[PDB]
């Protein structure tokens, strides 16, 4: 993550991030809406940062320090470049929506009134198709990635030393290889929960209530499609096990 965005999302809520005198000017229903919108962005910042730990800290560090057989790193980190491109684009759109909404002379006071359109764009057409195919691939290679990590940590002394070294910092306590992989699998199932609670406080403007309702339906169509496309890959599976 970058310092600017981390400070912007360091507070425990939107009501705590904006200046106290700016919060006082808004209705409770708006404060409650902005709180869930702020949580959606704050957790999307964290999601993108989890994918940067996988690509830049784990994946790249392994390639440059270790001498692993080609294809082992890809098996440890399936689709991480594609996931990083999908989510980094989404995060850029959300942070710009917040930036546009800032009061002049302020870097922290804002109200996002339109979100539904952005969620409909992200979860419809080509972008949604790419996301459906990427998460079906990732979750089908999830178990294999974990079996592969465990195999390497228990057999290679050098790989063990690399892990202990890069995971030692306190800021990496929740972010080891296995944790990063479950964090990524669990992200997609967080979107309907956040969007539903944003929708619960977005009835003031009918176009918005309708856009958030369409977005909720699109995220569930996608989740149902990823769940249907999943088929766990086994590390060293035999053809006979696959066709029976």
């Amino acid at each position: 993550s970058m310092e600017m965005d981390e400070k912007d999302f360091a507070a425990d809520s939107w009501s705590l991030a904006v200046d106290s005198s700016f919060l006082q000017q808004h209705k409770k229903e708006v404060m409650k809406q902005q709180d869930v919108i702020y949580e959606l962005i704050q957790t999307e910042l964290h999601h993108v940062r989890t994918l940067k730990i996988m690509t830049r800290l784990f994946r790249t560090g392994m390639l440059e320090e270790l001498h692993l057989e080609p294809g082992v790193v890809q098996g440890l980190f399936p689709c991480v470049d594609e996931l990083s491109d999908i989510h980094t684009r989404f995060l850029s759109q959300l942070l710009e929506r917040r930036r546009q909404a800032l009061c002049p002379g302020s870097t922290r006071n804002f109200v996002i009134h339109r979100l539904g359109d952005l969620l409909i764009s992200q979860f419809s057409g080509p972008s949604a198709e790419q996301m459906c195919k990427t998460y079906s691939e990732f979750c089908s290679r999830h178990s294999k990635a974990l079996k592969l990590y465990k195999e390497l940590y228990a057999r290679d002394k050098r790989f063990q030393q690399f892990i202990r070294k890069v995971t030692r910092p306190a800021v990496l306590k929740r972010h080891g290889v296995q944790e990063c992989i479950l964090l990524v699998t669990q992200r997609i199932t967080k979107y309907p929960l956040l969007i539903s609670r944003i929708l619960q406080h977005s009835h003031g403007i009918e176009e918005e209530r309708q856009d958030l309702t369409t977005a909720l339906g699109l995220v569930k169509e996608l989740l149902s499609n990823v769940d249907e496309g999943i088929y766990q890959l086994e590390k060293g599976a035999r053809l006979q096990e696959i066709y029976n």
């Binding site: 705590l16 869930v36 979750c139 929740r174 944790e179 964090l183 929960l193 769940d227």
Partner: protein, 179 residues
């Protein structure tokens, strides 16, 4: 400092997200209760043993039968949750959750947890339940369910008041350490 993994399972509004948030946050959420729980690695010292307890939620996965079991690999203790204000969520403990957890987590201790125990003395809760011929889950109905499903134990807590929350997590650490 040994590493153990804990996963909480249960129906939609059984209070599992609220429970993980209130335990992990040393700071009660007076201003805003987050909608989602990411993950957390807790520092627990139970009976003189220091353990790093990874906490995970299954909220949002309840309708996706192929995505959900990706949360189970290497779990050392399962917290099976139900809401004391929802006898319907208890009925699903033996028919749906217990068989799934025994299948993907053979020999992993399960602690049956009754959340929102404070709602047993809430006027609005009792008035609403009585409309559909129901009443708050009784302590013995929880104990009997834990007994029937072969649970390691039965515990009750209240995420709202924090009562019994720390005891659940220290007990789950003891369960995770057993071999």
């Amino acid at each position: 400092a040994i590493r153990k993994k804990l996963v909480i399972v249960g129906d939609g509004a059984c209070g599992k997200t609220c429970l993980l948030i209130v335990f992990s946050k040393d700071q009660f959420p007076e201003v805003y209760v987050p909608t989602v729980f990411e993950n957390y690695v807790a520092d627990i010292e139970v009976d003189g043993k220091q353990v790093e307890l990874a906490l995970w939620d299954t909220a949002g996965q309840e309708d996706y039968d192929r995505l959900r079991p990706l949360s189970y690999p290497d779990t050392d203790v399962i917290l099976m949750c139900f809401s004391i204000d929802s006898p319907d969520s208890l009925e699903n403990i033996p028919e749906k959750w217990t068989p799934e957890v025994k299948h993907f987590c053979p020999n992993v201790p399960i602690i049956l947890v009754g959340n929102k125990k404070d709602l047993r003395n809430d006027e609005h809760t009792r008035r609403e339940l009585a409309k559909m011929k129901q009443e708050p889950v009784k302590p013995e109905e929880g104990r009997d369910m834990a007994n029937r499903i072969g649970a390691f134990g039965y515990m009750e807590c209240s995420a709202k008041t924090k009562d019994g929350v720390r005891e659940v997590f220290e007990m789950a650490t003891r369960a995770a350490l057993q071999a």
